[PDB]
Nucleic acid binder design. Structure first.
Lengths: 55, 229, 101, 48, 83
RNA sequence: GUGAAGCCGGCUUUCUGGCGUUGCUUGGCUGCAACUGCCGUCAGCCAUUGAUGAUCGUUCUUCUCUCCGUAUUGGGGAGUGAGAGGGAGAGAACGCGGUCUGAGUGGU
């Protein structure tokens, strides 16, 4: 008996995946905590104002 | 409640259900080597193979085409350490096969002997892999050489061992850590240099796979030694 | 062609059995559709518990350091704050250098 | 050869330390049970 | 994904070693890098011309890459000058 | 645990019983054998329970099967048949499950 058709249906239809938020949290704990392991107003506005207004 | 799927590599299975685990058939039923959990199906017991701790398991889950470790095969294992990966290899080769576990560290050697007591197909060799002539009496001609020594001249160590104990047409599986070979060079640059050095001896690398999800800066190279004309 | 497997199995990198393997082997265990849904739900529960325990570890690591950092403050030696406390990290202090007599 | 390399000898092994003191407790429990039987059975003849 | 899988011939991927390149760069900066006292061969050979009984110009008087557009305008101005 | 009802045969032994099947034979309603195969008939003997306890108690999946056969979508029955599940005892591996603190004390 040839199981190729049956095996293909069971190896493809049952498709499931863990979330990205789940996977990324697991992979960072595996990394470790050691040092080697772990990874609108400017000064121009203020300066020019005090020259013109209070200078 | 478990459903078991055959894996593409003979002697390896994959276990689903409550657990997402890659498993091998237990050679010694009822025994756990390093605390791995076991499941039974009906009569047949399987042991989980941790990809985070082992590098061969990571390569298998990474999509490697060939591992060449098969039932009834002789395997020379360089860098046995405590024997976590050795125990799974002993499962695959079965009673017919033999595993030669070479480890230089004394503390890791004590764990091998306890494991070797319970498994008849494991032959412990507490020696230095840089001198294959110092243990030639114990090892006959083998089929596959696995090297996981993580040491800068790994290529020369394998070649010395391959010349003495690996048959013509035999295969080798080598794990390379990029930062161990050279810490400052890039990983892909380091891996290509080792590929060049393998070609200098009569070794033909046939494939290369990086172990990104479970490790970092690691690659596995599978090739043939002295290929037949 | 090089892997001798079906094109659909190329997508699943973790297990892609060969053509001759597939027509000579049989999947073992639960094979009914209703059981497979129950199988899928078990995966979510275990992975969620793993996620929850990991996040608990991260918080407990931070809490222990802050209590330890507060304990270091109960010292007469002069100190200067170099960083403010945050949710993830405690405040960092540098102490004056005197040998313990 | 592996035992020789790891300095395993008959003197260095401490398994007999663990075995002896486990047996030493077992013999004490056995001795207690049997002595009570001598005192109880012979107590019906000479309780004093 | 076709991008993940790559097929390469054994002899082509052999390229220059990055470790070797760093070794060459160290020699270059040690001998001809910033902080050294180096001159040009044209200037070095022109020191003899300044001391001769009859002074001459630089050994190589023309600079090829100093200017190209400026060179053409000088020729244009010259032709105008003869009228 | 319940508490009064169950079961109804054997061996000798005539009528030189019949009814049958299964193999070989046969010119022939021919013979030869086998039966752990049925229905008798004719007389004789033998044995013939229970308050000192009659009667009555099991889930699933399957096969070894078997007989009726509704043989076509069947049904039953007998299985020291296998296991699954439940109860009791004896072992092995693993888990709950995580090993106080850290610079001051005494004399003068």
């Amino acid at each position: 008996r040839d199981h190729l058709r049956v095996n293909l249906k069971f190896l493809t239809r049952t498709r499931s995946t863990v979330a990205e938020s789940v996977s990324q949290q697991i992979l960072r704990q595996n990394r470790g905590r050691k040092a080697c392991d772990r990874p609108v107003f400017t000064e121009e506005d203020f300066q020019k104002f005090q020259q013109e207004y209070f200078g | 409640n478990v459903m078991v799927e055959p894996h593409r590599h003979e002697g390896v299975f994959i276990c689903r259900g409550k657990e997402d685990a890659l498993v091998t058939k237990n050679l010694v039923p009822g025994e756990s080597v390093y605390g791995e959990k076991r499941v039974s199906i009906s009569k047949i017991e399987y042991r989980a193979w941790n990809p985070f701790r082992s590098k061969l398991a990571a390569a298998i889950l990474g999509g490697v085409d060939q591992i060449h470790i098969k039932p009834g095969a002789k395997v020379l294992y360089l860098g046995a350490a405590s024997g976590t990966t050795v125990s799974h290899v002993s499962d695959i080769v079965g009673p017919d096969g033999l595993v030669y576990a070479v480890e230089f560290s004394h503390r890791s050697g004590r764990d091998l002997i306890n494991l070797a007591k319970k498994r008849t197909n494991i032959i412990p060799v507490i020696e230095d892999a840089r001198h294959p002539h110092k243990y030639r009496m114990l090892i006959a001609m083998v089929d596959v050489i696995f090297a996981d020594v993580a040491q800068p001249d790994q290529t020369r160590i394998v070649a010395l061992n391959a010349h003495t104990f690996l048959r013509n047409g035999g295969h080798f599986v080598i794990s390379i850590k990029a930062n161990c070979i050279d810490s400052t060079a890039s990983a892909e640059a380091v891996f290509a240099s080792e590929v060049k050095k393998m070609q200098q001896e009569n070794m033909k690398p046939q494939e290369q796979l990086t172990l990104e999800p479970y490790e970092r800066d690691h690659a596995v190279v599978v090739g043939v030694y002295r290929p037949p004309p | 062609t090089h892997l001798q497997t079906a094109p659909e199995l190329v997508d699943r990198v973790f297990n892609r059995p060969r053509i001759e393997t597939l027509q000579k082997e049989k999947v073992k265990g639960v094979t009914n559709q209703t059981g497979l849904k129950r199988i899928a739900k078990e995966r979510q529960k275990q992975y969620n518990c793993l996620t929850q325990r990991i996040e608990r570890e991260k918080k407990l690591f931070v809490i222990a350091q802050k209590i330890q950092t507060r304990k270091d403050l109960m010292d007469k030696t002069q100190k200067v704050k170099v960083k403010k406390e945050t949710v993830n990290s405690p405040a960092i202090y540098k102490f004056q250098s005197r040998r313990k007599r | 050869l592996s035992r020789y390399r790891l300095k395993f000898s008959a003197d260095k092994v401490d398994t007999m330390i663990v075995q002896a003191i486990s047996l030493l407790d077992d013999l004490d429990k056995e001795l207690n049970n049997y002595i009570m039987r001598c005192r109880e059975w012979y107590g019906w003849h000479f309780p004093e | 994904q076709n991008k993940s899988y790559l097929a390469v011939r054994l002899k082509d991927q052999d390229l220059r070693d990055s470790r070797q390149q760093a070794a060459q760069a160290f020699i270059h900066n040690s001998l001809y890098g910033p902080g050294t006292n180096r001159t040009t061969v044209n200037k070095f050979l022109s020191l003899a011309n300044k001391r001769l009984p009859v002074k001459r110009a630089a050994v190589q008087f023309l600079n090829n890459a100093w200017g190209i557009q400026k060179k053409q305008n000088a020729k244009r101005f010259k032709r105008r000058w003869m009228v």
